[PDB]
């Protein structure tokens, strides 16, 4: 009854059966931040937040219309007092 030879359904693209990571050559970043290396050992220690991306900079991150010349002069007068 509903068998219509004119109605053809095409495969969904991209196919989830195939390796969707390698479809567009998207393996570099996945390998970079992979859970484990090819041998299964842990690559780097893992944590939650941005703090360790600023550790190289100097500092102690223990806890995580307009007249510029006039303001600079005011600050200079305040400091000289």
């Amino acid at each position: 009854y509903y068998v219509d030879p004119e109605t053809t359904y095409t495969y969904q693209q991209p196919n989830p059966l195939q390796d969707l990571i390698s479809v567009y050559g998207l393996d570099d970043i996945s390998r970079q931040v992979a859970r484990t290396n090819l041998d299964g050992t842990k690559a780097v220690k893992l944590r939650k937040s941005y703090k360790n991306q600023i550790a190289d900079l100097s500092g102690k991150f223990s806890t995580i219309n307009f007249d510029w010349d006039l303001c600079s002069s005011v600050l200079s007068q305040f400091e000289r007092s």
Partner: protein, 43 residues
């Protein structure tokens, strides 16, 4: 985990419809021809 679930459910559904097509052909030969077309309609 979601991708593995998707792949496993795809394999399960594939075997489901393969077995169903096979048995519908077996006990109902007269409907065998559309069933293959159904595969052609799906695959």
């Amino acid at each position: 985990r979601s991708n593995q679930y998707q792949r496993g459910k795809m394999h399960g559904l594939k075997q489901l419809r393969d077995s169903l097509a096979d048995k519908i052909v077996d006990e109902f030969p007269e409907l065998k021809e559309p069933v293959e077309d159904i595969i052609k309609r799906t695959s």
